[PDB]
Write a protein that binds this ligand. Structure first.
Ligand code: 8Q1
Ligand code: 8Q1
Ligand code: FES
Ligand code: FE2
Ligand code: FE2
Lengths: 123, 400, 81, 118, 74, 392, 123, 81, 74
């Protein structure tokens, strides 16, 4: 395993849940198509529009868990439009994912988009 | 510090007695066993025949019925392809199961590409085939029936004697893949009515790169050779016989024949300990395969709501295996777990534990404690576990 | 033959706790104990002599394998800490 | 910018598909209900997007890269007109191209299993 | 304490709950141990208190008192 | 007391450095190289990649072009049968020589039984093929040309570079059986235009039961796998890769690369010593092959009017080999000796001497002394010698 | 490499030749069909029709040389009629010849018969 | 470094003369002699250090192989008489 | 005796005809030998006359007379 994936797996960042019934909380629950990987990503957006909290729960491999932790710690501090500019290519390049583990970065990007879309739908 | 080894199904450590037997032929007796004119060849040939007798004595066969190969993969290829090609003029149908090893399955697929007809028998939820289904699947042009003795992934045991009785009654050659069974459970080719058997050296604490295939001589079973050459091994397997490797294989067979009863009792006790300790501390843990016809040395457990490779990564101090698709080089799901009727999510949650000759109670307890702690953590991280606690019942997930 | 058997058993244990590898060391020690207690009640002197000769052969094998493993040694297991 | 390509499945059905310039063979076949696995999803890791290319258009495709070749080494029933479907991009010179699905892939499905579309 | 460690060793090697191992109890009669068990007890005493007991003294070591006297002497 | 081993052609003794490299993986590192989730598998795989790089560095190839097998027999089977079966739809003709190893010949004979056409090229009296003959034998539907680099019976070398040039000009795949040439003579796959090469472990002082085959990747050469399974070794050979054996093969390749020049000079000196001392004392002794294109480590001599196996039995304290039909389990004469044009009574009189890395001048002198004595005795016993003395 | 073959090869009996011009000497020179083994066998008979001396010269394998020397010592001391009863099976049984080595005993029997026939033809 | 090279050469020769096998003993002695003679006029200290390190590794390999061959020893060759 | 064994060994180890080995002949100046050859001569002397020459004494051994004196004394 890569040392960065090992670090994000052994010390996962922002693991938890948020009140999904809140007006200012978007929930994205996605699943990988070719494997059983499942990611649940949630965000908290303040009155400014800047993400102040992110948290994930992931059923999947260590690469998927690392991708979810990294995706949470990346959209933390950004805005909606900036969070929309986060690509699975960026996640995979940062984590040095081999070609068989790119589904993890794809699922992380899908979960970010799903959470953002849910927040936009309720707002 | 090195991790504990609990992956004996993949391979086993070399037995010190086997290495002690091998070393003289790696140092001083380096002659070619097929050299007929000098003492190096004579002594190499004598050692090879001694090893052949040891293997035959282990499996209850005649020494002349043993052919040395490079492994159980080559043994399975030789058996299946040679029988099918030799009896091609009249027999064009083959029978095997859906839970067979990749070598057997790929040989059957390549034969299908060659114009043969292959029936993949389904298995029950216990992992055991149905004898009525096998009898109904036998055709007048059936050539070979291939059923493995012990499954390498779930460890279930097939009714080899009854299958052999049926095949003998129907005049069909019976082949069994006993790579996971030789030296671990009793085997008798004559009592079980077995025509062909596959043996792997490194599954019985012998050296890697060596194997054997049993071919019945009365009534004679014929195969068409796959490796062409000088006609060594009675013409079924050409090439130079690796004398140190075959000596090690024979020594491993003798050691297994001497230690089988003690090893089985010790492994049964250890497996019972591990299974009860895991089940009494972790809820929602199921065992894949029926315990009543299970070899205790191969334990497959599904840890619900925890992914297999994530659990393997958490257990970095224990060498294990998993059936998850994320552990495969081509994202291949576990076809054995699919065949036995496991759900996809539970199949992604399977862990294989291996208990062998050198496993200790200390290692078993350490593995159990680590498993309990890390499964609890990963379930606390699990959205599926949270969903089941809430009651959503996993109905709706965006799979994109 | 009691003294000879007890000396052979002591030598076998002493040599077996010299294995560099955890698996080989533990297996050899436990196997020697189990076998010696298994053959505690044998009465036939020919059978006793056969067992003693087998034990001598196994002790020679153990000596050779222990020294070879010491020559090619690796790190320790995690549980050995 | 319309490209017409024919898909031939395992049973021999001739499926006509109206593609577009710049389209991907795997995505197009999965959109039109063609049972092409494509497990890795164009990640050059599974080689289950294996397809047979008609001889009249095989020479018209960009020559395969070293990674595509390495990955084709793992595909069963390999032929001289073998390509990875995830690496083929539709172009106007591929009019009437026919892609034949092999009988088996790298992943074992001897029970007749059909993976859900990816 | 040396004799405390000797008694701990004997209790661990004999499974006697660390209560009946006194300064006059024998390994064979008072406690449950045969010749093979005694060989192991002597080797474990050698393991803990680093020494190489000769056979002459090893045959003499039959009681907890004998083992304690030998260890305190050497 | 044991006899002297001069039979390096049949098999070589294990090199002590090869055994020293192997032992750690026979003792501590016993994991499966194809295990993908634990340290045992990772370290075994790292060792196997190291060995692959070692073999590739020896033969001047890329590591990804090396496939580990169980020996040169399996390597030859894979090359010939896989190439022929992969290019069946258009190429149905194979070319090989009349003095090839039995594995190559039997693969060609089994392919003939499969509906292929095989041409067996004859050799001159020197044991070397004719390039004009090969050029004329190449057809538009020719799949593969197989010529061994060094003959295992007479030790003659073939013009491998010229054959590779011809094959690339004619757009035909070139396979060479180098099981007697690796680590003994310089080999370069890119400079000899070689598409497939066979390598044997126990012929280069490595362990038995292991081998390798080189398959050119640029331009890509495809083969059809003969061993089905889980698709290891890039899908070209299934089954578990034996880690101790492949580490041993790689170590042997490294040692051969480091020692080839020393070994060649020493073997050459020992070879002329042996040949000159035999030919200066025994009349009517001829060499089988051509000295100008000869590897000195394989010496095949014919002792007129003396039978080969009788000479071998007289040489009880030297381990040698013969081409006589009485040394064969099926009374088979030496087809190589027949092909090179040797008369039958001289083909029944052939002895193959072998000089290797561990051969000594003392052993060479002892063998020469014993050979002279026993050939003199058997010639005194020979009725053919008597008749030749009588001018008949 | 059976002990009797080794003995008879390392200490061959009656190696040499007899005069071919003598009336009481028969020479049999015959060869093997499938191999290059060649035996020459000569016998000496007296007024009473008793074979008193025999010699051999063999170009062939060790088993062929042993068979020829056994044939010579077996033929010495008998008559023509008794020497006509020496079959290859007896030689093979005495030398413990493996199935691949029966040509040696066959060729030795052929040499014996040729020598007797040559002698009686000279008579 | 002369003294170090002379001590290492002496140790290599002494250890190689203890091989139990004729071929290994003779080859090791001849190779050590020939290699030290071939590398006699080297001037680069880096190259000399590399040769010394390689010789140390070779001496370790020789020690292990000599003692293993002593553990597994066979009959002497006919010419050793 | 001994000193003829010494001369004989020096002769077969420096390949010198077995006439230039004199009681005052030096190993490096008179005879033809370098440091590596001297290491071999000392080892051959040790092998013939069973002993273990220390490093200081081996360094002192530079002449046929020195080897003679050492072998006589030891
Ligand atoms: P103690 O109270 O005097 O009693 C102990 C003994 C056994 C000495 C006593 O009960 C006795 O005299 N019994 C008579 C029977 C007897 O002496 N049997 C012992 C035979 S020796 C034996 O058991 C050999 C077992 C083989 C050991 C090899 C283990 C394998 C190791 C290989 C691992 C790599
Ligand atoms: P003297 O004045 O001491 O002269 C001797 C030396 C060589 C020390 C002197 O000539 C000198 O100073 N030369 C300079 C170069 C030098 O020191 N070279 C020596 C380097 S060490 C060397 O050559 C390593 C060779 C390795 C031998 C291993 C071979 C064994 C193979 C294994 C067999 C199984
Ligand atoms: S989809 Fe896996 S390689 Fe093309
Ligand atoms: Fe995954
Ligand atoms: Fe013969």
């Amino acid at each position: 395993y890569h040392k960065k994936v090992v670090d994000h797996y052994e010390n996962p960042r922002n693991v938890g849940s948020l009140d999904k019934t809140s007006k200012n909380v978007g929930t994205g629950l996605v699943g990988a198509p070719a494997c059983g990987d499942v990611m649940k990503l949630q965000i908290q957006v303040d009155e400014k529009g800047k993400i102040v909290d992110a948290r994930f729960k992931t059923f999947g491999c260590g690469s998927a868990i690392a991708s979810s932790s990294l995706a949470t710690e990346w959209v933390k501090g950004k805005t909606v439009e900036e969070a929309l500019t986060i690509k699975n290519t960026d996640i995979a390049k940062e984590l040095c994912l081999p070609p068989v583990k790119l589904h993890c970065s794809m699922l992380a990007e899908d979960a970010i988009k799903a959470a953002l879309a849910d927040y936009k739908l309720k707002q | 510090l090195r991790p504990l080894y609990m992956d004996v199904q993949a391979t086993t450590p070399l037995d010190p007695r086997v290495l002690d037997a091998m070393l003289p032929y790696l140092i001083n007796y380096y002659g070619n066993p097929h050299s007929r004119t000098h003492a190096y060849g004579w002594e190499s040939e004598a050692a090879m025949e001694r090893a052949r007798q040891q293997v035959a004595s282990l499996i209850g066969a005649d020494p002349r019925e043993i052919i040395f190969t490079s492994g159980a993969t080559e043994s399975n290829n030789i058996a299946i392809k040679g029988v099918a090609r030799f009896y091609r003029s009249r027999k064009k149908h083959l029978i095997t199961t859906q839970t067979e090893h990749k070598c057997v399955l790929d040989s059957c697929r390549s034969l299908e590409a060659e114009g043969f007809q292959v029936t993949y028998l389904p298995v029950q939820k216990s992992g055991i085939i149905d004898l009525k289904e096998l009898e109904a699947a036998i055709q007048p042009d059936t050539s070979l029936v291939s059923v493995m003795t012990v499954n390498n992934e779930i460890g279930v045991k097939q009714p080899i004697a009854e299958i052999g009785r049926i095949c003998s009654s129907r005049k069909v050659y019976f082949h069994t893949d006993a790579a996971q069974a030789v030296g671990k459970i009793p085997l008798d080719v004559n009592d079980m009515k077995i025509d062909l058997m596959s043996i792997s050296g490194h599954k019985i604490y012998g050296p890697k790169g060596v194997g054997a295939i049993y071919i019945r001589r009365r009534p004679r079973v014929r195969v068409e050779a796959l490796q062409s050459g000088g006609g060594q091994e009675r013409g079924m397997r050409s090439g130079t016989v690796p004398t140190p490797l075959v000596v090690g294989l024979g020594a491993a067979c003798e050691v297994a024949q001497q230690e089988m009863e003690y090893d089985h009792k010790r492994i049964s006790k250890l497996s019972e300990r591990l299974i009860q300790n895991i089940m009494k501390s972790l809820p929602d843990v199921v065992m894949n395969g029926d315990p009543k016809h299970h070899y205790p040395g191969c334990i497959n457990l599904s840890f619900a709501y925890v992914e297999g490779e994530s659990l393997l990564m958490a257990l970095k101090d224990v060498a294990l295996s998993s059936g998850s698709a994320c552990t495969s080089a081509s994202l291949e799901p576990s076809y054995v777990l699919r065949a036995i009727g496991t759900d996809e999510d539970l199949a992604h949650s399977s862990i294989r534990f291996g208990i062998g000759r050198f496993t200790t109670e200390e290692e078993v307890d350490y593995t159990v404690e680590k498993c309990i702690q890390h499964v609890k953590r990963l379930r606390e991280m699990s959205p599926l576990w949270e969903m089941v606690q809430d009651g959503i019942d996993l109905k709706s997930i965006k799979w994109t | 033959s009691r003294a000879q058997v007890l000396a052979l058993y002591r030598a076998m244990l002493r040599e077996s706790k010299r294995f560099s590898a955890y698996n080989y060391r533990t297996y050899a020690v436990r196997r020697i104990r189990d076998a010696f207690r298994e053959n505690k009640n044998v009465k036939d002197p020919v059978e006793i002599q056969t067992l003693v000769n087998k034990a001598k052969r196994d002790l020679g094998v153990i000596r050779r394998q222990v020294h070879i493993g010491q020559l090619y040694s690796t790190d320790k297991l995690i549980i050995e800490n | 910018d319309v490209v017409n390509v024919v898909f031939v499945d395992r049973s021999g059905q001739r499926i006509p598909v109206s593609g577009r310039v710049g389209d991907n063979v795997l995505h197009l076949a999965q959109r039109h209900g063609v049972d092409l696995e494509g497990a890795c999803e164009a990640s050059l890791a599974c080689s289950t997007c294996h397809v047979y290319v008609s001889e009249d258009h095989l020479d018209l495709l960009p020559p395969p890269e070293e990674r595509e070749d390495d990955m084709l080494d793992m595909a069963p029933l390999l032929q001289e007109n073998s390509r990875l479907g995830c690496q083929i991009v539709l172009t106007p010179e591929l009019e009437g191209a026919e892609f034949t699905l092999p009988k088996i892939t790298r992943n074992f499905y001897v029970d007749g299993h059909v993976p859900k579309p990816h | 304490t040396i004799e405390e460690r000797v008694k701990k060793i004997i209790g661990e090697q004999l499974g006697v709950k660390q209560e009946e191992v006194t300064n006059n109890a024998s390994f064979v009669e008072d406690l449950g141990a045969d010749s093979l068990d005694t060989v192991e007890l002597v080797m474990a005493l050698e393991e803990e208190f680093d020494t190489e007991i000769p056979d002459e003294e090893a045959e003499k070591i039959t009681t907890v008192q004998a083992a304690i006297d030998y260890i305190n002497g050497h």
